[PDB]
Amino acid sequence: MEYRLKAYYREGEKPSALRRAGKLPGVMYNRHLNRKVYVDLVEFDKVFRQASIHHVIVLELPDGQSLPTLVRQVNLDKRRRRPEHVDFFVLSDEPVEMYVPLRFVGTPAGVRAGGVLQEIHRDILVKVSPRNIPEFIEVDVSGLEIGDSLHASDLKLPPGVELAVSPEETIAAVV
Amino acid sequence: TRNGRDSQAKRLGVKRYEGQVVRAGNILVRQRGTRFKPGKNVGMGRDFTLFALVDGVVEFQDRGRLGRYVHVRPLA
Amino acid sequence: LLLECTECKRRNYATEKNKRNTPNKLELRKYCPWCRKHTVHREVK
Amino acid sequence: MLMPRRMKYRKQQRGRLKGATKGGDYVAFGDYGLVALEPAWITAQQIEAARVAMVRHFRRGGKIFIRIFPDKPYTKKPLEVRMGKGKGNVEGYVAVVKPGRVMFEVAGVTEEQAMEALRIAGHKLPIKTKIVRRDAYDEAQ
Amino acid sequence: PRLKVKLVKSPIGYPKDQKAALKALGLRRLQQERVLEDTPAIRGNVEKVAHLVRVEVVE
Amino acid sequence: ARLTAYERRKFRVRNRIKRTGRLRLSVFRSLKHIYAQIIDDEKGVTLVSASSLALKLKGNKTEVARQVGRALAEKALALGIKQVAFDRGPYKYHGRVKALAEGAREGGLEF
RNA sequence: GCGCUGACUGGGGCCUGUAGAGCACUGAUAGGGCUAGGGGGCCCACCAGCCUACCAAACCCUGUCAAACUCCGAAGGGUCCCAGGUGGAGCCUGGGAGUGAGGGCGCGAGCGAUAACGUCCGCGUCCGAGCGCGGGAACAACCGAGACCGCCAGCUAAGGCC
RNA sequence: GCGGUCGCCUCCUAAAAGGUAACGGAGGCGCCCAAAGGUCCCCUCAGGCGGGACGGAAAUCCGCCGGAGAGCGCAAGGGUA
RNA sequence: CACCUCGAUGUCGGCUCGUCGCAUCCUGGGGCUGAAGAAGGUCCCAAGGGUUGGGCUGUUCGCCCAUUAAAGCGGCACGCG
RNA sequence: AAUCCCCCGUGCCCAUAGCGGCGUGGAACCACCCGUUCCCAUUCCGAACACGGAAGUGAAACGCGCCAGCGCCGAUGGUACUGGGCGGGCGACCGCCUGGGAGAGUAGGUCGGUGCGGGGGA
Ligand SMILES: [Mg+2]
Ligand SMILES: [Mg+2]
Ligand SMILES: [Mg+2]
Ligand SMILES: [Mg+2]
Ligand SMILES: [Mg+2]
Ligand SMILES: [Mg+2]
Ligand SMILES: [Mg+2]
Ligand SMILES: [Mg+2]
Ligand SMILES: [Mg+2]
Ligand SMILES: [Mg+2]
Ligand SMILES: [Mg+2]
Ligand SMILES: [Mg+2]
Ligand SMILES: [Mg+2]
Ligand SMILES: [Mg+2]
Ligand SMILES: [Mg+2]
Ligand SMILES: [Mg+2]
Ligand SMILES: [Mg+2]
Ligand SMILES: [Mg+2]
Ligand SMILES: [Mg+2]
Ligand SMILES: [Mg+2]
Ligand SMILES: [Mg+2]
Ligand SMILES: [Mg+2]
Ligand SMILES: [Mg+2]
Ligand SMILES: [Mg+2]
Ligand SMILES: [Mg+2]
Ligand SMILES: [Mg+2]
Ligand SMILES: [Mg+2]
Ligand SMILES: [Mg+2]
Ligand SMILES: [Mg+2]
Ligand SMILES: [Mg+2]
Ligand SMILES: [Mg+2]
Ligand SMILES: [Mg+2]
Ligand SMILES: [Mg+2]
Ligand SMILES: [Mg+2]
Ligand SMILES: [Mg+2]
Ligand SMILES: [Mg+2]
Ligand SMILES: [Mg+2]
Ligand SMILES: [Mg+2]
Ligand SMILES: [Mg+2]
Ligand SMILES: [Mg+2]
Ligand SMILES: [Mg+2]
Ligand SMILES: [Mg+2]
Ligand SMILES: [Mg+2]
Ligand SMILES: [Mg+2]
Ligand SMILES: [Mg+2]
Ligand SMILES: [Mg+2]
Ligand SMILES: [Mg+2]
Ligand SMILES: [Mg+2]
Ligand SMILES: [Mg+2]
Ligand SMILES: [Mg+2]
Ligand SMILES: [Mg+2]
Ligand SMILES: [Mg+2]
Ligand SMILES: [Mg+2]
Ligand SMILES: [Mg+2]
Ligand SMILES: [Mg+2]
Ligand SMILES: [Mg+2]
Ligand SMILES: [Mg+2]
Ligand SMILES: [Mg+2]
Ligand SMILES: [Mg+2]
Ligand SMILES: [Mg+2]
Ligand SMILES: [Mg+2]
Ligand SMILES: [Mg+2]
Ligand SMILES: [Mg+2]
Ligand SMILES: [Mg+2]
Ligand SMILES: [Mg+2]
Ligand SMILES: [Mg+2]
Ligand SMILES: [Mg+2]
Ligand SMILES: [Mg+2]
Ligand SMILES: [Mg+2]
Ligand SMILES: [Mg+2]
Ligand SMILES: [Mg+2]
Ligand SMILES: [Mg+2]
Ligand SMILES: [Mg+2]
Ligand SMILES: [Mg+2]
Ligand SMILES: [Mg+2]
Ligand SMILES: [Mg+2]
Ligand SMILES: [Mg+2]
Ligand SMILES: [Mg+2]
Ligand SMILES: [Mg+2]
Ligand SMILES: [Mg+2]
Ligand SMILES: [Mg+2]
Ligand SMILES: [Mg+2]
Ligand SMILES: [Mg+2]
Ligand SMILES: [Mg+2]
Ligand SMILES: [Mg+2]
Ligand SMILES: [Mg+2]
């Protein structure tokens, strides 16, 4: 649930060079501040595979600090589908917006053995308090039924806060 | 082949740019619709052609929603 | 229908053009002569 | 095979292939994918042979995606003729594919299975390819 | 801060507007040096032929 | 419902006026009163004001108009101003709008 | 004859809709969802009528494509102004012409087969007329370099140094 | 040779000024209108939903929503409430 | 395609004389066989030599008769006036 | 006249000023309103336009506020592309140097700003 990164500071130095030196460029920003940094590619990869804009990265970084950051965009060059720039979003005391995984729980969900699990969104956009950050979200109902649909307001929704628009959407069905 | 046709290039466009000195008569823009609208001291003929109404210099104005304008600000 | 309409003395013949079989009447309208000024002007030949 | 019905214009130039995959580009439907390493015109009849090869090696279930589509009209004279007098004539359709693009991509199958299918499917293509899984990065939206 | 420009690579096969610059400077022959007033305009042509010239700073 | 016969007709007549180059004798009339304003565009500036709600007069608003009509002349003509165009905005050239214009006599005019 | 106006360059204004990208229009388009009506399969044959294992409008997501699509839009290019720029520069009037069969290469497109020492344009360059000199084994146009004459002097370019 | 073409307009090709070729990709003109002309005054579309005898997808009407996707005699483009 | 040749580079087939390639028709040597043997199939090595006589047609080619270890395919200005 | 608040005019910027929800304002302005004699009117209608009035109302409209659901605006980094200069691959194409540098998207921002002139206030 807790991922450590590291970091450094950028001002000059062409990203081309950093790139060459195993380091991965990137910026750090939010309502209050904005500064350019660079992580270690080999390191960052290890973290992001598991992290993945779903969980929080604390970002060490000289300055001795440890900043609460979500990753809000990853630019990867298409030719080799490897990353080439990460930008980290730092959390403060004010509800944010993010993506939360969807633990497809329950069973074949009604009419079991069998039916259609119908996987739509392994994530979901939610406006939530930076303090309480759901590790995931239980998606069960029971279940379930045949040719039904768990909209969105039917879902669990832990004591985070709420949804992010889209009151009515798929997420569930059997056909 | 059923194709092969085309028409003579009509050499359309702006004839005087901003900060160019013109004279009553000088046509300033050749265009189809009203891509530019006649501003200060700027007439426009039946083929939508903009020309200086007086002598002076040329200035352009982008009135956003109101379109773009060619003015001939005097000096005469 | 090529048309050449005239005045009402010393001729004139300031020619115009009425295309069809309507207008098909005398096809006349008030016009201006090179001589005096503004007279009737009728249609012929 | 696979052509786009109703077209504003039949016969279109050819343009170049200097691009680098508009995108794309990051997998977005299945568990695994086939990515284009080289630029090429992929023919509807090449796509159909790649699709079939998979649905076939998948017993019949299966769940392709393709993601590339032949909307470009490919012309060609009637051979035995000389230049001039009209253009090509249209003898099929192609899809334009620069590196990066994700073609096909499958889901709902094992790994040692999906990966064997994508390999087969890849042999039907005139370019070099690459098999992928799909990690966070892919979740670029 | 006068500049010392010196033609070191032949413009045989370069655009005509580049042969024009080498002229605007006054460079007519290879190895020829010319010391000119370091101004923006005079620098324009010096950096245009930057691949054919070798520049030094002088008194 | 974007823009209205009012707003439209307003621009239409007022746009034409602003082309001719002259100073604008803009006329706003309300249910109770009628006001008049001589504006210079390109300078975005008013020169001579003349209301009825500013001259605290009343009694038959077609006759009041003409008064604020003649009132505009006097004040204005004394500033050099003689020739002008005359807005009219949304109002048909009639009644108290026509009246004020007819009052604008004793001052440049041509209207 | 006029004579600093020239190419090129610096600064400044204005013009543009390509490269790239985009999907807001015109169309194309993968999957899923929800639903006009039909395929239907059918109950009736009086309303009807239930279901969607083929469609499939719109609408919503997730994905994409386009010379004759563009909500966007660089670099560049054009033009005017003010400066630098004296050059086999510029401009004006006139005498004499020759040329009006081009070709290779690079870059950008069309045609062609993402064929041709192919073909047709664009911007550049060289050969043409530099079949003079060095390199590339030899070789008009690739690299180097513009040959006034002489030297049994020197430094270099490309390319090389068993 | 046979075939096709030959002037004019629109679009692309055309590489963001102008211009630019090919038996390159596609369309159109050889008219028309005494009102479809001038001026002054007014008026604002297309669609979508709901409502309403004969009215049906669509005749005329009422309501709300509708920045232009309508219209501008005919091609295309630009333009335009 | 139109690059040398139109102040001339004689054009099919046959005959004659060859020579070369090997993607081998036979003969030599091999591996595999759904190779019992004999006889085949298929692939590998191998160009030393060999590779028939007739009917038809200008024919090349091809069909056919009789044979054969086999009746090989190509290049040489579709080799050679 | 100074400063300021509200309101009526009229400009300019041309969506950060817009849609929508909610809340406010009638002393004054404005609107609606009250009438259709008169000017003048509606291819029918005093709806509009127009006149004469003012009892009534801020319901509609308009003005002023608040709300970021939509609309609009939108960096910073990083890329794409590309002047100019160099390389590489049979090609289709790719890379380096030096200058310029988007589009999408992210963080955000916004439910206006201001000129002149009036009327009323302090
Ligand atoms: Mg042509
Ligand atoms: Mg044209
Ligand atoms: Mg602009
Ligand atoms: Mg005449
Ligand atoms: Mg994308
Ligand atoms: Mg050279
Ligand atoms: Mg000078
Ligand atoms: Mg110049
Ligand atoms: Mg300049
Ligand atoms: Mg634009
Ligand atoms: Mg493009
Ligand atoms: Mg679209
Ligand atoms: Mg569509
Ligand atoms: Mg679909
Ligand atoms: Mg384009
Ligand atoms: Mg266009
Ligand atoms: Mg923008
Ligand atoms: Mg320039
Ligand atoms: Mg400039
Ligand atoms: Mg000068
Ligand atoms: Mg000369
Ligand atoms: Mg001369
Ligand atoms: Mg002469
Ligand atoms: Mg000729
Ligand atoms: Mg010629
Ligand atoms: Mg040529
Ligand atoms: Mg040439
Ligand atoms: Mg050339
Ligand atoms: Mg050569
Ligand atoms: Mg190159
Ligand atoms: Mg070539
Ligand atoms: Mg050639
Ligand atoms: Mg070159
Ligand atoms: Mg010659
Ligand atoms: Mg040479
Ligand atoms: Mg030369
Ligand atoms: Mg030679
Ligand atoms: Mg030589
Ligand atoms: Mg040599
Ligand atoms: Mg040589
Ligand atoms: Mg010399
Ligand atoms: Mg010498
Ligand atoms: Mg030495
Ligand atoms: Mg060296
Ligand atoms: Mg050597
Ligand atoms: Mg013929
Ligand atoms: Mg152009
Ligand atoms: Mg309607
Ligand atoms: Mg209806
Ligand atoms: Mg109805
Ligand atoms: Mg239109
Ligand atoms: Mg039209
Ligand atoms: Mg149009
Ligand atoms: Mg239009
Ligand atoms: Mg020839
Ligand atoms: Mg030729
Ligand atoms: Mg001879
Ligand atoms: Mg001979
Ligand atoms: Mg074999
Ligand atoms: Mg053998
Ligand atoms: Mg045996
Ligand atoms: Mg054997
Ligand atoms: Mg062999
Ligand atoms: Mg015979
Ligand atoms: Mg034989
Ligand atoms: Mg035969
Ligand atoms: Mg025989
Ligand atoms: Mg032989
Ligand atoms: Mg032959
Ligand atoms: Mg022969
Ligand atoms: Mg003979
Ligand atoms: Mg012979
Ligand atoms: Mg106001
Ligand atoms: Mg806008
Ligand atoms: Mg509102
Ligand atoms: Mg209230
Ligand atoms: Mg309100
Ligand atoms: Mg009260
Ligand atoms: Mg009261
Ligand atoms: Mg209210
Ligand atoms: Mg109000
Ligand atoms: Mg943006
Ligand atoms: Mg940037
Ligand atoms: Mg941006
Ligand atoms: Mg706010
Ligand atoms: Mg005041």
Swiss-Prot record, chain A:
GO MF entry, a single one: 5S rRNA binding
Keywords: Ribonucleoprotein, Ribosomal protein, RNA-binding, rRNA-binding
This protein's GO CC annotations: cytosolic large ribosomal subunit
Keyword Ribonucleoprotein: yes
Domain of life from the UniProt record: Bacteria
Keyword Repeat: no
One of the GO BP terms on file: translation
Function recorded in the entry: This is one of 3 proteins that mediate the attachment of the 5S rRNA onto the large ribosomal subunit.
Assembly: Part of the 50S ribosomal subunit. Contacts the 5S rRNA; has been isolated in a complex with 5S rRNA and uL5, 5S rRNA and DNA binding protein II; 5S rRNA and uL18; 5S rRNA, uL5 and DNA binding protein II.
Family, similarity comment: Belongs to the bacterial ribosomal protein bL25 family. CTC subfamily.
Name of the protein: Large ribosomal subunit protein bL25
UniProtKB/Swiss-Prot annotation, chain B:
Stored Pfam families: Ribosomal_L27 (PF01016)
Superkingdom field: Bacteria
Signal peptide region: none
SUPFAM superfamilies in the record: Ribosomal L27 protein-like
GO biological process: translation
One GO cellular component term noted in the UniProt record for this chain: cytosolic large ribosomal subunit
The entry's keywords: Ribonucleoprotein, Ribosomal protein
UniProt xrefs under InterPro entries: Ribosomal_bL27 (IPR001684), Ribosomal_bL27_CS (IPR018261)
GO molecular function: structural constituent of ribosome
Function: Found on the solvent side of the large subunit.
Description of how the protein assembles with itself and partners: Part of the 50S ribosomal subunit.
Similarity annotation: Belongs to the bacterial ribosomal protein bL27 family.
Name of this protein: Large ribosomal subunit protein bL27
Gene name as annotated: rpmA
Swiss-Prot record, chain E:
Molecular function via GO: structural constituent of ribosome
Domain of life: Bacteria
Species of provenance: Thermus thermophilus (strain ATCC 27634 / DSM 579 / HB8)
Pfam family, one: Ribosomal_L30
Subunit details: Part of the 50S ribosomal subunit.
Stated name of the protein: Large ribosomal subunit protein uL30
Keywords carried by this UniProt record: Ribonucleoprotein, Ribosomal protein
Family to which the UniProt record says this protein belongs: Belongs to the universal ribosomal protein uL30 family.
Family annotation (CDD domains): Ribosomal_L30
GO cellular component, one term: cytosolic large ribosomal subunit
GO biological process: translation
NCBIfam families: rpmD_bact
Swiss-Prot record, chain F:
Organism expressing this protein natively: Thermus thermophilus (strain ATCC 27634 / DSM 579 / HB8)
Subunit structure: Part of the 50S ribosomal subunit; part of the 5S rRNA/uL5/uL18/bL25 subcomplex. Contacts the 5S and probably the 23S rRNA; has been isolated in a complex with the 5S rRNA and uL25.
A Pfam family annotated for this UniProt entry: Ribosomal_L18p
InterPro entries: Ribosomal_uL18_bac-type, Ribosomal_uL18_bac/euk
Name this polypeptide is given: Large ribosomal subunit protein uL18
UniProt-recorded Gene Ontology molecular function terms: 5S rRNA binding; structural constituent of ribosome
Gene Ontology cellular-component annotations: cytosolic large ribosomal subunit
Transmembrane portions of the chain: none
Keywords from the named record: Ribonucleoprotein, Ribosomal protein, RNA-binding, rRNA-binding
GO biological process, one term: translation
Family from the record: Belongs to the universal ribosomal protein uL18 family.
Role noted for this protein: This is one of the proteins that bind and probably mediate the attachment of the 5S RNA into the large ribosomal subunit, where it forms part of the central protuberance.
PANTHER family linked: 39S RIBOSOMAL PROTEIN L18, MITOCHONDRIAL, LARGE RIBOSOMAL SUBUNIT PROTEIN UL18M
Protein's UniProt keywords contain Zinc: no
